[PDB]
């Protein structure tokens, strides 16, 4: 689970 | 979401004038906001990111400016490969972004008023069961023309379609077919059909008709 | 370094469509993918877009439902399958590398000599979506009738699907003058296209003018002879 990953995550469902 | 908006649509400038482009975003986005150029033919490739730092490779005479609502594209001296449009982007939904509906730069030209010629139908069309009238408009500058189709002295409307060249590469002007569609029943059921064209080279406007079967 | 597009053409309505955007010379892994779209003479849509591991998608409205972004990592590739497709789909695709979200400062607070997103650009994907079947043109003349020592003369390449059309004059002997305008979409589903040509007067009783269209996807070849 890169770092890459979770701020994808953050910033497509923010 | 955010919507962004161009002013103006349309832009005429020559070789070393100086351009200013605006964008405008529906909401703050503060700086998160960039710049991009377009050729026919071609993708469009960013010039500006952060609404005023420049993009590697890109030339020193564009620059960008402005934070919140209200965005600045300059081009301090046009060039001859600046003929282009423009969009900006905004990002502050990154990574969801939505572009400005474009500015369009032509080059700047002496006015030329367009001639203007109207073709009757072929012969050969009028058999098929349909009849279409092109009107000419051939060499003007600016592009900005009205083409009003009148049967009978009666405006047309909804049934007329018109096409504009891009600026020709010698001359600077545009030139514009337009074509109204009848069928043959209705061309036969009426006799004068004209092409009135409004320019700003033409002092008034200029009709060119026929009287059909002449 | 380029991203190379394949796919496209033309579909019948609710019919499907895949495009594939394949990516050399940068880590593909590490980037959001993205698809854009411009209708003729419109400007610049978002379509969708793909988080690098592919997890995450965001779509424009008009899209949702319909539209699905894809990824293949291990072949760089990009994908983008459209289902139940309108009219309104009909545009020139774009497939766009976008940003690495480590960079994010990027956005806002320039920090390197450039900008590591939307610099690389798909070739485009021309979709046009229509249930017109394909057709040949039908070339009529546009006769010079009776300025200035120079005549008008054309011809109305009419009721060909899909696009495009090639238009000649003498063999590509003749090219001052000549105006090939804009193909226009008519509400019957058919192009409809002109040329024209500005001629000296003189000449129309000498000089015999043809138009050479050629359509290639109906195989059509039609040589008319405008005559005065």
Known sequence: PSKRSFIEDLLFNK | ?214 | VQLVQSGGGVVQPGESLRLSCSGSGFTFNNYIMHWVRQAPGQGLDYVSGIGSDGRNTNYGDSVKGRFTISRDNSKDTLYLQMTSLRAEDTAFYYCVKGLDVLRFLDLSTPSGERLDAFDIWGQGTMVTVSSASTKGPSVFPLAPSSSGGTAALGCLVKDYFPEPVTVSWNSGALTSGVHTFPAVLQSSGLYSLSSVVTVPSSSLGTQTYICNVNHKPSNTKVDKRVEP
């Open chain 2, 1 to 214: 979401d955010i919507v962004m908006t161009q002013s103006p649509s349309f832009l005429s400038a020559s070789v070393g004038d100086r351009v200013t482009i605006t964008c405008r975003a529906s909401q703050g986005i503060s700086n998160y906001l960039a710049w991009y150029q377009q050729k026919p033919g071609k993708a469009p490739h960013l010039l500006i990111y952060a609404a005023s730092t420049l993009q590697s490779g890109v030339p020193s005479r564009f620059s960008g400016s402005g934070s919140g609502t209200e965005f600045t594209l300059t081009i301090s001296s046009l060039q001859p490969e600046d003929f282009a449009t423009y969009y900006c982007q905004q990002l502050n939904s990154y990574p969801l972004f939505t572009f400005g509906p474009g500015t369009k730069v032509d080059i700047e030209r002496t006015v030329a008023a367009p001639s203007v010629f109207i073709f009757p139908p072929s012969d050969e069309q009028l058999k098929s069961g349909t009849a279409s009238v092109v009107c000419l408009l051939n060499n003007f500058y600016p592009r900005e023309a009205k083409v009003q189709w009148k049967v009978d002295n009666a405006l047309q409307s909804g049934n007329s379609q018109e096409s504009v060249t891009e600026q020709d590469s010698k001359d600077s002007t545009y030139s514009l077919s337009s074509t109204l569609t009848l069928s043959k029943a209705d061309y036969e059921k009426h006799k004068v059909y004209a092409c009135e064209v409004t320019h700003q080279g033409l002092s008034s406007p200029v009709t060119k008709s026929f009287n059909r079967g002449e």
